[PDB]
Design a protein around this ligand. Structure first.
Ligand SMILES: CCCCCCCCCCCC(=O)OC(C)C
Ligand SMILES: [Mg+2]
Ligand SMILES: [Mg+2]
Ligand code: NI
Ligand code: NI
Lengths: 226, 227
């Protein structure tokens, strides 16, 4: 089976590279497996199910890539950990541009990913960032200021904290959202070609410079609040 | 006479985006839903690529026009309020026009490359507005220029950017301009493309605005240290 479902995922991933989602076809996938259109449907019931399999696969590969890169190390500091994560995410997106598009690019209209399948893997990189930043809180380099956000943002953040076992207060969590948005934004601008013609000679150097600013956001205090 | 037909074609194209994305763009379907014949449509919009190009130009222009309107109702002391107002207007446009945002800043359309002679100008209008708001912060001294040089080749690339946008920054401020654009685009895309998920944030606009205020603090080096 999974030998079969594996091949489906591999095929579908190729159809993604070539035509994007529109061109997903349990029809093509069917021929290749020496199979009748109808035969495939037990393994993968529908175009949607294919899409969710392809999503879980991309998310997992990305997260495994990140996990691997953290196990590689200068354990020196939380900030070096954050940089290593960001660099791994970007490197993965640059090597897998169509799968980056799948994950963080345009939605497939008519498709809604059942969270029960996607939630877990979809938060593993987010989770890595939180884990990395939690180290900087435990060692005092990232100073909690007990600056409470208005509701309902504060209660939103409290759920997020509990989910991830993250000890950052409301300001740290705001800064984490900025970090993630900046990382995903920078990557997508590069990968999707949106800086355009002859603008950046080495987009990676610019990405690294952005990450360093985002680290400095986490490390310094911007309001008179003590 | 063409002009008015082209408009109904483009409006129906905007609808197909909403319903099928760039995939479902079809001049033939359009051609029907206007009680017209397929062969008649190519006379007004000659290909899928031309339809996409019209839809891109339309979207970039509407987005920029929305920014420009929001700035005209920031009547203010403040370069920072301007930056915040631009960012808010971009997000508002994107959430209200999510399929057109996808067309602009989402995944590339396989096989298609926008003609820079139709798209490049309008595509720089909002970036341009941010540089103009930020330049006012530099003029008043809230954003201080240094002689620090960004790591190469950034510094070299940045000189060409400052010239193109008539922006009187230094390297450091330009880096922070790239950060702001990335943060804005990135935050909007995560919300609009449905990564956040339904429940997580009660109003994502509120977190977004907090992020923009942090980006303003980065530009102005508004922080202190306990040394
Ligand atoms: C806060 C602003 C930061 C500025 C950095 C980004 C500038 C991106 C401009 C892209 C224009 C483009 O598409 O032109 C092509 C030739 C086609
Ligand atoms: Mg790929
Ligand atoms: Mg729309
Ligand atoms: Ni302080
Ligand atoms: Ni300082």
């Amino acid at each position: 089976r999974e030998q079969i479902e594996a091949k489906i995922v591999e095929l579908g991933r190729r159809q993604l590279l070539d035509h994007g989602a529109a061109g997903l076809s349990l029809r093509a996938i069917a021929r290749n497996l020496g199979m009748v259109s109808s035969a495939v449907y037990r393994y993968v019931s529908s175009r949607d199910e294919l899409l969710t399999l392809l999503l879980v696969d991309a998310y997992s590969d990305l997260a495994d890539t990140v996990d691997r890169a953290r196990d590689d190390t200068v354990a020196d500091s939380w900030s070096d950990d954050v940089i290593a994560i960001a660099r791994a995410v970007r490197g993965w997106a640059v090597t897998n541009p169509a799968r980056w598009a799948l994950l963080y690019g345009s939605p497939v209209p008519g498709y809604h990913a059942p969270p029960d399948r996607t939630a877990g893997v979809a938060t593993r990189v987010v989770g890595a960032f939180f884990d990395a930043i939690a180290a900087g809180i435990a060692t005092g380099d990232i100073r909690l200021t007990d600056d409470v956000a208005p509701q309902p943002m504060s209660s939103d953040f409290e759920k997020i904290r509990q989910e991830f076992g993250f000890p950052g207060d409301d300001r740290v969590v705001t800064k984490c959202f900025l970090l993630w948005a900046g990382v995903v934004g920078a990557i997508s601008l590069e990968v999707f070609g949106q800086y355009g013609a002859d603008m950046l000679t080495d987009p990676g150097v610019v990405f690294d410079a952005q990450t360093r600013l985002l680290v400095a956001v986490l490390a310094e205090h911007h309001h008179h609040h003590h």
